[PDB]
Design a binder for this molecule. Structure first.
Ligand code: 1VU
Ligand code: BTN
Lengths: 64, 136, 290, 210, 135, 69
């Protein structure tokens, strides 16, 4: 997570394959919705966050 | 002194992997900082280091350690604060530490990485000349 | 001439300068760089005049490719380990980038905003005489998008004579600020709660203002309305819910809530680096007395 | 009179307090003519003038100079000096609440819009949004109180009044006023040589379209 | 025997490089050896810049001339580039600044002859060395 | 866990919410005075106040459970 914020959306299923440039999550912070974009193809493994949960900067959203 | 057994052979014959971690420490860019504790804790025994005034004038690190059981005082520029510049507060911090070691015969090891003195009218008006001369 | 191609924006990237002052008769707020000392330092490092524009990158992550010529760059503010072709170079230092090389900023170890300056400045088209963007009115150059092309202006004849500036490390958590008391400090049952409280910065903070939580401030007369009055960057409003708000660079020209204090010009630029979840402490800059 | 109460507003600005908008606007013109060296901005408002300075170094010298200025008595007025209307605004009075809250003060909707059309409005202070302007010194029977609630989605060009104020919303925004009508005049546009159609110190009058 | 330096300045001779720094180090080391042994007096009569300033600081008395001598470690233009404040050499490092603010100066002479007079007055009280009695 | 817990040993100078009040992450729950400084405790998750176990003027130990959910 690039910043502290609220997980307004989690966009993928546990274990789901993903392509680089798709969206994992959206965080409300800075009075703005910030998308989290997958940086490589892979499988979304152990998706550790729940919608509406608050989280703190640098926490792992998933391994990739 | 603590009892420490000196290993035999040359300085180049006795390099540990922890010593070899120093060869890659310094960033390629002259301006990218690094934590000087990565040097201090590798040249001191057991990595053991008793930092003094850790929260004050963080652009210079001073404190005690041991080298082969001998107590030593470390005085080291810290690139991560003011790029390692000297200032009034660092100069007084290091000057009294050095004079305390010298009273009690503790050898001093200096780790130098200083681009200069910290520029500014606040330093000039507060006496960087008079109080920097303390560390000299 | 030289241009940058924006490969990645990071969470937000804005063109900024010293802003558009004096337009309060049009209702236009000054905006400009949130941390003016960092902005101006980056310009001075590249030997720009300080009104030349820079890119304010928020939470880092910005990346661009230099095309069409060599350019001198500097990055100041939040330490993002700025790098060229993946080789880091110092924050608060100049670097010379050759044609075709890639400039990248990581995530900031502390602070919030990094300013990328280029020799000759980011020469997008000015709006109302400034290249700054106002997040509340959206006046100014549009927030940068991937694939944006940024012109590099013609440089002055002066040359960069200093390789780096030493700068004090940005505080990681507790930020301590000097506040001028009032003018409306007499509106409150006990205004020294302002300096007795460890305020916590909420996730709602942005360029318009930073919103705190703490001990509620109590109005002396909670039904009392305020005639709206001029506002400035670093003014500490107290909405009637009792939680303070510190106005940022894009604050509205006039405010509707009592300003209990204003951060001294010595400290206002430190507000430009405080991230959500940091603690804030306030002290009166000189003795508050009614 | 000779000066208001004055507060430090931080170390970089000074706030002058006044009893009524005629003071704030006459003092604004006085400070504009004073050309005070080191001022960077002057912000008139509902009961105050804020002066912004190039830095803390100027605050005490400026506070000392302020005691030397005196406003011209003939410049304090509540009506236009040549009775002129500088800007005329076409408006259609399809207002959302001119009848429901306001006309119950006494004047029927037709009387409300006729008084509003027939009385000069001053362009007072400016704020809330670019090219939004607080019109003041209009007809005293129109002074319905603020709605005691926020609004939202208030249309671009929407014509409104509350308190001693009238005005036109330049864009979709969270206003707070009663709505009397609408105008298609472009209240703000950065690409117009005068981006704000209304600027403080002018006088404007609405002209009815329906 | 007392040592009088009439420092004038401009720092290290940049073309000669690091040797000028080694000679500064040697001059400072001798000022420290001499410290508390012989009276050391520094007259500042020009822009003592950079390395030239630490030697006066290590001497016992520093006499400056009011409008025409300055000391600073780093110049107004580097100060401008880093800190952004514009300052003149006189404001940054003049004799008034080193008297009233920095506390480094011991006298501010109205001219070079007045500075020489004050140095002779100082020497009239000081002994030649710590093993001698004052005159 | 769902417990809001006191980060410090201090006295509850103000309770901001009541049981069955809806709260959102980052809303204020209580203020603790210690060392002459006053410190907020705020909700870690969206929910509604239950298990409320402190009151204004109570001195509480570090790690005291204030409320849940
Ligand atoms: C450790 C010590 C250092 O790092 S010193 C680094 C910076 N050195 C300086 O230049 C000192 C600071 N500079 C200044 O503020 C002024 O230039 C000083 C030197 C104090 C006064 O110079 P000013 O009276 O304006 O004369 P000017 O600039 O016209 O120069 C006259 C001639 O002097 C020479 N000069 C001067 N400083 C140095 C120096 N440090 N090394 C070598 N040469 C020096 C200039 O080159 C010039 O020679 P010329 O007459 O042009 O042939
Ligand atoms: C985000 O919540 C900060 C809002 C700061 C600007 C708004 S504008 C309308 C209110 N009136 C004022 O003076 N500040 C508030």
């Amino acid at each position: 997570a690039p910043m502290q914020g609220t997980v307004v959306k989690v966009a993928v299923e546990e274990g789901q394959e993903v392509s680089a440039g798709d969206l994992v999550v959206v965080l409300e912070a800075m009075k703005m919705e910030n998308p989290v974009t997958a940086h490589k193809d892979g499988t979304i493994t152990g998706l550790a966050v729940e919608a509406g949960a608050a989280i703190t900067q640098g926490t792992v959203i998933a391994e990739i | 002194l603590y009892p420490v057994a000196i290993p035999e052979g040359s300085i180049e014959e006795t390099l540990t992997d922890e010593d070899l971690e120093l060869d890659t420490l310094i960033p390629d860019s002259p301006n990218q900082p690094y934590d000087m504790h990565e040097v201090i804790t590798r040249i001191l025994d057991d990595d053991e280091f008793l930092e003094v005034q850790a929260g004050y004038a963080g652009n210079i690190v001073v404190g005690f350690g041991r080298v082969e059981g001998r107590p030593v005082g470390i005085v080291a520029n810290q690139p991560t604060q003011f790029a390692g510049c000297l200032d009034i507060n660092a100069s007084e911090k290091a000057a009294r530490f050095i004079r305390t070691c010298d009273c009690f015969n503790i050898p001093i090891v200096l780790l130098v990485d200083v681009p200069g003195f910290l520029p500014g009218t606040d330093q000039e008006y507060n006496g960087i000349i008079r109080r920097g001369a303390k560390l000299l | 001439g030289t241009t940058l191609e924006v490969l990645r924006t990071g969470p937000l990237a804005l063109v900024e300068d010293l802003g558009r002052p004096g337009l309060a008769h049009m209702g236009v707020t000054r905006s400009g760089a949130a941390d003016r000392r960092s902005h101006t330092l980056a310009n001075r490092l590249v030997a720009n005049p300080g009104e030349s524009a820079t890119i304010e990158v928020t939470f880092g992550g910005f990346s661009a490719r230099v095309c069409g010529g060599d350019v001198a760059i500097a990055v100041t503010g939040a330490d993002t380990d700025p790098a060229v072709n993946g080789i880091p170079f110092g924050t608060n230092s100049i670097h010379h980038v050759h044609d075709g090389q890639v400039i990248s900023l990581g995530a900031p170890h502390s602070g919030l905003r990094s300013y990328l300056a280029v020799r000759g400045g980011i020469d997008v088209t000015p709006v109302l005489g400034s290249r700054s963007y106002d997040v509340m009115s959206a006046i100014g150059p549009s927030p940068l998008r991937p694939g944006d092309v940024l012109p590099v202006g013609e440089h002055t004849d002066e040359f960069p004579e200093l390789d780096q500036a030493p700068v004090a490390a940005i505080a990681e958590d507790v930020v301590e600020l000097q506040v001028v008391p009032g003018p409306r400090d007499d509106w409150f049952v006990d205004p020294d709660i302002l300096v007795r409280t460890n305020w916590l910065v909420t996730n709602r903070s942005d360029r318009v203002g930073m919103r705190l939580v703490g001990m509620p401030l109590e109005y002396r007369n909670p039904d009392r309305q305020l005639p709206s009055e001029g506002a400035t960057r670093g003014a500490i409003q107290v909405p009637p819910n009792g939680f303070p708000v510190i106005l940022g660079p894009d604050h509205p020209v006039t405010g509707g809530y009592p300003v209990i204090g204003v951060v001294t010009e010595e400290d206002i630029d430190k507000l430009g680096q405080v991230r959500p979840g940091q603690t804030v402490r306030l002290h009166w800059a000189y003795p508050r007395r009614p | 009179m000779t000066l208001g109460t004055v507060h430090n507003y931080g170390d970089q600005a000074l706030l002058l307090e006044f009893d009524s908008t005629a003071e704030v606007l006459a003092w604004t013109e006085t400070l504009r003519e004073a050309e005070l060296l080191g001022v960077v901005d002057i912000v008139p408002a509902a009961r105050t003038v804020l002066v912004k300075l190039a830095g803390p170094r100027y605050q005490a010298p400026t506070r000392q100079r302020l005691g030397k200025l005196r406003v011209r008595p003939e410049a304090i007025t509540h009506q236009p000096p040549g009775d002129r209307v500088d800007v005329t605004i076409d408006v259609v009075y399809d207002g959302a609440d001119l009848h429901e809250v306001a006309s119950l003060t006494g004047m029927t909707p037709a009387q409300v819009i006729a008084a509003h059309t027939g009385t000069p409005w001053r362009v007072g202070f400016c704020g809330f949004a670019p090219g939004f302007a607080y019109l003041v010194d209009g007809d005293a029977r129109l002074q319905v109180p603020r709605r005691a609630e926020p609004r939202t989605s208030v249309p671009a060009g929407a014509v409104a009044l509350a308190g001693e104020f009238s005005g036109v919303y330049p864009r979709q925004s969270p206003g707070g006023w009663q709505l009397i009508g609408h105008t298609d005049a472009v209240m703000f546009d950065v690409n117009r040589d005068k981006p704000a159609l209304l600027t403080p110190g002018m006088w404007v009058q609405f002209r009815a379209v329906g | 025997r007392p040592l009088i330096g009439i420092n004038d300045g401009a720092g290290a001779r940049i073309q000669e490089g690091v040797v000028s720094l080694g000679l500064y180090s040697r001059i400072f080391h001798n000022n420290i050896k001499a410290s508390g042994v012989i009276p050391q007096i520094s007259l500042i009569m020009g822009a003592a810049a950079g390395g030239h300033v630490y030697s006066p600081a290590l001497t016992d008395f520093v006499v400056m001339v009011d409008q025409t001598s300055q000391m600073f470690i780093t110049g107004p233009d580097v100060i401008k580039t880093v800190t952004g404040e514009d300052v003149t050499m006189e404001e940054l490092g003049g004799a008034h600044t080193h008297m009233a603010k920095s506390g480094t100066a011991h006298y501010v002479a109205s001219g070079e002859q007045d500075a020489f007079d004050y140095v002779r007055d100082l020497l009239s009280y000081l002994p030649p060395n710590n093993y001698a009695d004052p005159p």
